[PDB]
Design a protein around this ligand. Structure first.
Ligand code: ZN
Lengths: 139, 194
């Protein structure tokens, strides 16, 4: 079950990075709606994602707790599908930003961080709100 | 049993509302009439509301938006969306489907269903104007036309914008009328006539 959610991270990041030139990796319709919802969010909230980035100084030495602090602010008032989509999109923005700075190794780290935060804090909410197929029913 | 207050309160920070100088030309998505204090818009289109301030409020300030019915006959009824648009799947993931007012382009938005008043509201953090500008601009969305029968059903409403501190104490209040319709231009020049 936790391994099933690690896949959603990697598939989301791999397709986001494949939309640019970079190639990377370390039913399908659930990932289809997530990816398009996420493409919507980078237009609507480009300035928020830019702020979240600047407060997370993304360096080779950046620890996980720094990333979990920024993401925990995103869910401060509660967890919903919109904020969950922003979470996937923000992670993808960080992976795209890292390979654009000649720091491709940092992608593998961001993916791990997203998988951990997903299982540790978001997954219990996801199961109690109709699972992932409740998300395809609304979006 | 009580009604929110419409009374203007510029407060200690000189709080005042502003709007764009859009005309009443046809196919205009949202326009404001100073003489009527009434904004005209069509469903789901961005209506810019700018916040003008004489003294920048401290960090942690909030901007809340809430709708009330204008006629004293209906002021005690909660302004909610029609049944057709509640079940309508137009949700952005952030706004609950029953709310009439939304805010677009702000990840930090939050929606309140008051556990005592049952009145809807939407609130964002207050932030000072962008460097070089002079006012904070907020983009609201109205998710149901006033003509919608079964919801508003031809009843004019007001939007109340309030500044509050971290704990929700009033720092400023302003209000303006709103009509959500198909032709905001022709309908504006009409209401301006009578
Ligand atoms: Zn309606």
């Amino acid at each position: 079950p936790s391994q099933d959610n690690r896949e959603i991270v990697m598939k989301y990041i791999s397709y986001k990075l494949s939309q640019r030139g970079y190639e990377w990796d370390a039913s399908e319709v659930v990932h289809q709606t997530l990816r398009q919802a996420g493409d919507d969010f980078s237009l609507r909230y480009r300035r928020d994602f830019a702020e979240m980035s600047s407060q997370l100084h993304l360096t080779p030495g950046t620890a996980y707790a720094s990333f979990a602090t920024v993401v925990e602010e995103l869910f401060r008032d509660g967890v919903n599908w919109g904020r969950i989509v922003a979470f996937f999109e923000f992670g993808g923005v960080m992976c795209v930003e890292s390979v654009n700075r000649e720091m491709s190794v940092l992608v593998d780290n961001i993916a791990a961080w997203m998988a951990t935060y997903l299982n540790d804090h978001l997954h219990t909410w996801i199961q109690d709100n109709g699972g992932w197929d409740a998300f395809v029913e609304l979006y | 049993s009580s009604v929110p207050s419409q009374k203007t309160y510029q407060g200690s920070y000189g709080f005042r509302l502003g709007f764009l100088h859009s005309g009443t030309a046809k196919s205009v998505t949202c326009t404001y009439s100073p003489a009527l204090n009434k904004m005209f818009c069509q469903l789901a289109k961005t209506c810019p509301v700018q916040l003008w301030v004489d003294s920048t409020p401290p960090p942690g300030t909030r901007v809340r938006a809430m709708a009330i019915y204008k006629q004293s006959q209906h002021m005690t009824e909660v302004v909610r969306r029609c049944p057709h648009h509640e079940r309508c799947s137009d949700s952005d993931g952030l706004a609950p489907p029953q709310h009439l007012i939304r805010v677009e382009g702000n990840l930090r938005v939050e929606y309140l269903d008051d556990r005592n008043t049952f009145r809807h509201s939407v609130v964002v953090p207050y932030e000072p104007p962008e460097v070089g500008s002079d006012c904070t601009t907020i983009h609201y969305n109205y998710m149901c036309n006033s003509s919608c029968m079964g919801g508003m059903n031809r009843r004019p409403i007001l939007t109340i914008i309030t500044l509050e501190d971290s704990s929700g104490n009033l720092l400023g209040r302003n209000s303006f009328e709103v009509r959500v319709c198909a032709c905001p231009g022709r309908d504006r020049r009409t209401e301006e006539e009578n």
